[PDB]
Amino acid sequence: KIKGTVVLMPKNNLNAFLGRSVSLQLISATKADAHGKGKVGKDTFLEGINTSLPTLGAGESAFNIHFEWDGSMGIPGAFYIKNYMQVEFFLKSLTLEAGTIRFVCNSWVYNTKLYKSVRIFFANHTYVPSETPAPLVEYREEELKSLRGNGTGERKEYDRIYDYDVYNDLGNPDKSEKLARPVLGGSSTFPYPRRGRTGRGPTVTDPNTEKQGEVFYVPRDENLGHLKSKDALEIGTKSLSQIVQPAFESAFDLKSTPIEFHSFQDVHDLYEGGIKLPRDVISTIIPLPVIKELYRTDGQHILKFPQPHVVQVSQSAWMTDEEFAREMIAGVNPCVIRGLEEFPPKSNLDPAIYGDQSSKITADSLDLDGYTMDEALGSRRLFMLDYHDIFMPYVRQINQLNSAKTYATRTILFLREDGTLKPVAIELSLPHSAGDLSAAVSQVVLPAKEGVESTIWLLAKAYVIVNDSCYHQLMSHWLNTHAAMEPFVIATHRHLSVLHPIYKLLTPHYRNNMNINALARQSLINANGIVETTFLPSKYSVEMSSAVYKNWVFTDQALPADLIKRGVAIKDPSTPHGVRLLIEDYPYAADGLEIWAAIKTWVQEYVPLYYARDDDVKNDSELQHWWKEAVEKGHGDLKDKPWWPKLQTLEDLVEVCLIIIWIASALHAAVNFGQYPYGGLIMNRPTASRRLLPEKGTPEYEEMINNHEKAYLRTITSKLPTLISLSVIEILSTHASDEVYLGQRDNPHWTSDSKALQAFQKFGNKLKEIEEKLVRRNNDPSLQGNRLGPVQLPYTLLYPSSEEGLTFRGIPNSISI
């Protein structure tokens, strides 16, 4: 007999797993039947509870099992398992002793009757397809066929079927015509990454829109369970939209709290004394998992939000021009600023539609610390935050909404000799066309510290940051991380076996991504969901991200390519990373290059363990099918584009894996974990603007003079949507205590290959080394202006490690929140 140990986690006593409850059958990797498929042994049941091993913990139990297995039956390489119990359990592992064979499973096993085919698990060996032991080749391909399913049917909780569909599940046209939304994906008008297929079928009123459902399916093992309810952060979004948001709304409908903030102190009060709300509103929040962690409460009437990092040292520093500019390089959205190499800035928009698009900013009006414009341009000291061409096509329709008004903005920045950025002009642009009923005009606003001009300049920064917050949430964050990554998740499970080296390399970087995305489609980006009800563009929000996706380029997601494309660095082979930054102390980019380099080294060391030559990549059938599908189906609306890597070389494989890991880990961390730390003060990161600048001689103009804080608050996001936005960004900025960070894996035995395990240890050591280096940077007094700023907030977003909570640091493996 072969002595084995099964470790599993009950859904939630242990004796019910005994008798005839659970059977396993070992499968040979070396002895085949007459069809060349590995021989399968007898059904073998769990025989007793193992009590010996202390190294267990975390709700796990271990079971003893002995398999009949003459050396005749060869060496086991897989096993089947059948659960005869009513309730599913979570299978962790099988270990066969005496040399040892390890099976890492980490999968829910439902009752046997629910599966078309018996659950199969492979030993922890790694094989490209041409290396699969012959008796497992068919089992390997059949499991992939199982995972792909057939493209039809309503997916159920226990299904493990990965497939693609368009974003046609956001609208709710059966409820109201007002909730109808365009399908995103699958047309030239609205290209978009695909998402995981759910198959709920058509609405009554629109055969192109998928009907509503209480649960948005993900393949079962994508739906992460948590030992602690407080760690199920993704379910908070659902509770917030479905339960908490209506509770807040009723407090305002009943006039139990003032409808608007009246001064900046009313906002600061949220994390000081708190806000007083009706008892039944407090009573709605307090017992909810995740939500109850968002606020401190007296259990009666008070909710208090946590103090955001951006105000922890100075509550007024956000208002400084130094901090406004610094956050474009070290803030929540540090990846949009561009070099400006000519002046005035140009527009590619059609003047026949929007009016003359010539910039109104004059060079002679700008304070460039004594530099002439030619000098600033030539010394590469001029930059911009350019939302003009992005927003202008949407300004007319946005401004037609009740309580939304925006400009398409452009901000010019000058890189001072001291290495900090300063803002020197903001252009607030509006489209103009012959029939317009509005008399509002485009304006240029310059910095000012006193008088009504200082208030107009503060408002101008707010309009800019409304554009930036919208672009950050929809494009930098949602489109470029969450949405862009999902097609790669699906392709990987459809086409790379669990045995495949590139499966093992990439899948840690997918943890929880399909799950959070599905919950997002249900409650965050749905019609009348959180984003539409809290951000400027309202019902146009998600379609705006489709327009931006038209210009998404996979190879420009690589950090060096991004920096070069935006004109914030230049190619320079004489530097360690091959690029020279044009803003030397650009914290996101300088820290990012270190992480990028570490990932690249890891990928370059792993790949050659499995692919010796370009030919070995061309000839890997799973890899070729994977990449073909990811591009032609997953990102199929951009399959016509010339820039996709072809995947016929070692270099191409490294490039593709490096970009995927980068997007999933560091890029997402840098744009996600700063949300509450910077945006928890709504004045610092307004999500919406509700009026344009006022005309002279109006009461709104006199208000700017007499009550500037009220002028500002009437312009930005109202109090009710503020309470909702703050709550959701608090959730999304939190690290669950069971997170798995870059340099970590959930199991030490993910492969039996010692060289791959060594390479991975080297990678984790390098990240520790990098963190020491980043610590030294933050402690360097010369770098204070950009790494800390007047808010005195050290840039820690790209520190690789973190404890649980709202920590402003730590790089998870994946897009996990």
Residues 161/147, Cβ–Cβ less than 8 Å = yes
**Does 482 participate in catalysis according to the annotation?**
yes
Estimate to the nearest angstrom the gap between the alpha carbon of 330 and the chain centroid.
18
Q: Which residues fall within 8 angstroms of residue 329, CB to CB, at 6 or more apart?
A: 337, 421, 583, 586, 587, 588, 589, 786
* Separation CA 522–CA 224 (nearest Å): 17
Q: Spell out where 51-138 has E strands.
A: 61-67, 76-83, 89-96, 101-109, 119-122
Q: 124, 333, 672, 786: which one is catalytic? A: 672
Task: Check if the beta carbon of residue 474 is closer than 8 Å to that of residue 395.
Answer: no
3-state secondary structure of 751: coil
CB count within 10 Å of CB 726 equals 26
Task: Reply yes or no on whether 668 is catalytic.
Answer: yes
Cis peptide before 587 (omega within 30 of 0): no
Site string for Fe ion, 733-772 (x = CB under 5 A): ----------------------------------------
CA distance 180 to 205: 10
CA distance 719 to 262: 10
Residue, CB closest to Fe ion = 672
| Total residues found in the chain within this entry | 817
- The pair of structure tokens assigned to 307 is 């103090």
Measured from the CB atom, the residue of 670 and 788 that comes closer to Fe ion is 670
Please give the Cα distance from 342 to 383 (Å, whole number): 10
Each residue 668-707 as x (binds Fe ion by CB under 5 A) or -, in order, gives ----x-----------------------------------
Residue 440: phi and psi, rounded to 5, are -60, 140
- CA distances in angstroms from 658 to 509, 578, 672, listed in the order given: 11, 16, 20
Give the x/- contact pattern for Fe ion in 583-622, rule: CB under 5 A: ----------------------------------------
| Closest distance of CB 478 from Fe ion, Å | 8
| Least distance between Fe ion and beta carbon 227 (Å) | 22
Question: At its nearest, how many Å lie between Fe ion and the CB of residue 266?
Answer: 29
Please, are residues 328 and 336 in contact by the beta-carbon 8 Å criterion?
yes
- Catalytic residue from among 309, 482, 493, 577: 482
**Cβ-based nearer residue to Fe ion, 46 or 729:** 729
Least separation in angstroms between CB 244 and Fe ion: 20
Task: Using the minimum distance from each CB to Fe ion, give the nearer residue, 516 or 536.
Answer: 516
CB within 8 Å of 141: residues ≥ 6 apart: none
* DSSP structural state of residue 365: G
Q: Give the DSSP per-residue string, 194-251.
A: -EE-----B-SS-TTSBPP-SS----GGGS---SSGGG-THHHHHHIIIIIHHHHHHH
Q: Which is nearer to Fe ion, 583 or 671 (CB)?
A: 671
203 vs 672, which CB is nearer to Fe ion? 672
Q: Is 3 helix (H, G, I), strand (E, B) or coil?
A: strand
In whole angstroms, how close is the CB of 516 to Fe ion at the nearest point?
7
Q: Annotated catalytic residue: which of 309, 477, 495, 577?
A: 477
Task: For residue 801, give the DSSP letter.
Answer: -
Q: Which is nearer to Fe ion, 409 or 672 (CB)?
A: 672
**Least Å from the CB of residue 722 to Fe ion:** 20
Amino acid at 175: K
Instruction: State which residue, 483 or 724, has the beta carbon closest to Fe ion.
Output: 483
Beta bridge partners of 3: 66
Q: Out of 493, 500, 668, 735, which one is annotated catalytic?
A: 668
The dihedral region occupied by 185, where left means phi > 0, alpha psi between -120 and 50, and beta the remainder, is: left
Question: Is 426 buried (19+), middle (13-18) or exposed (0-12) by CB count in 10 A?
Answer: buried
Taking CB under 5 A as the rule, which mask of x and - marks residues 113-132 in contact with Fe ion?
--------------------
Closest contact distance (angstroms) between CB of 675 and Fe ion is: 8
The active-site residue, picked from 27, 390, 815, 817, is: 817
How near is the Cβ of 222 to Fe ion at its closest, in Å?
16
517 within 8 A of 234, measured Cβ to Cβ: no
Catalytic status, residue 749: no
Residue in this structure with the two tokens 């930054």, named with its chain if needed: 581
- Per the annotation, binding residues for Fe cation are 477, 482, 668, 672, 817
Of 315 and 473, nearer to Fe ion (C-beta) is 473
What are the respective helix, strand and coil percentages of the chain, to the nearest 5?
Answer: 40, 15, 45
- Cα torsion angle, 248, 250, 252, 256, sign: negative
- Report the nearest approach of Fe ion to the CB of residue 671 (Å): 8
CB of 553 to Fe ion, least distance (A): 21
- Closest CB to Fe ion among residues 629, 730: 730
634-673: contacts with Fe ion (CB under 5 A): 672
CA dist list (Å): 30 to 72, 129, 137, 245, 256: 10, 16, 11, 59, 74
Query: Has 577 been annotated as catalytic?
Result: no
Residues 56-95 that bind Fe ion (CB under 5 A): none
Report how far residue 233's alpha carbon sits from residue 516's, in angstroms, rounded to the nearest whole number. Answer: 9
3-class SS string, 601-649? HHHHHHHHHCCCCHHHHHCCHHHHHHHHHHHHHHCHHHCCCCCCCCCCC
Q: Could you say whether residue 715 binds Fe ion (CB under 5 A)?
A: no
Number of residues that bind Fe ion (CB under 5 A): 1
Longest dimension (CA), the chain: 97
From the CB of 738, what's the least distance to Fe ion, in Å?
17
**Cβ distance to Fe ion smaller for residue 24 or 483:** 483
Residue 135's H or E segment, with its range, is: helix 134-148
Annotated binding site: 477, 482, 668, 672, 817
Q: Find all residues with CB under 8 Å of 330, minimum gap 6, and list them.
A: 586, 587, 588, 786, 787, 789, 795
Nearer to Fe ion, 209 or 672 (CB): 672
Provide, rounded to whole angstroms, the least separation between the CB of residue 673 and Fe ion: 9
State the DSSP code for 319: G
Q: Binding residues for Fe ion, per CB under 5 A?
A: 672
Residues with catalytic roles: 477, 482, 668, 672, 817
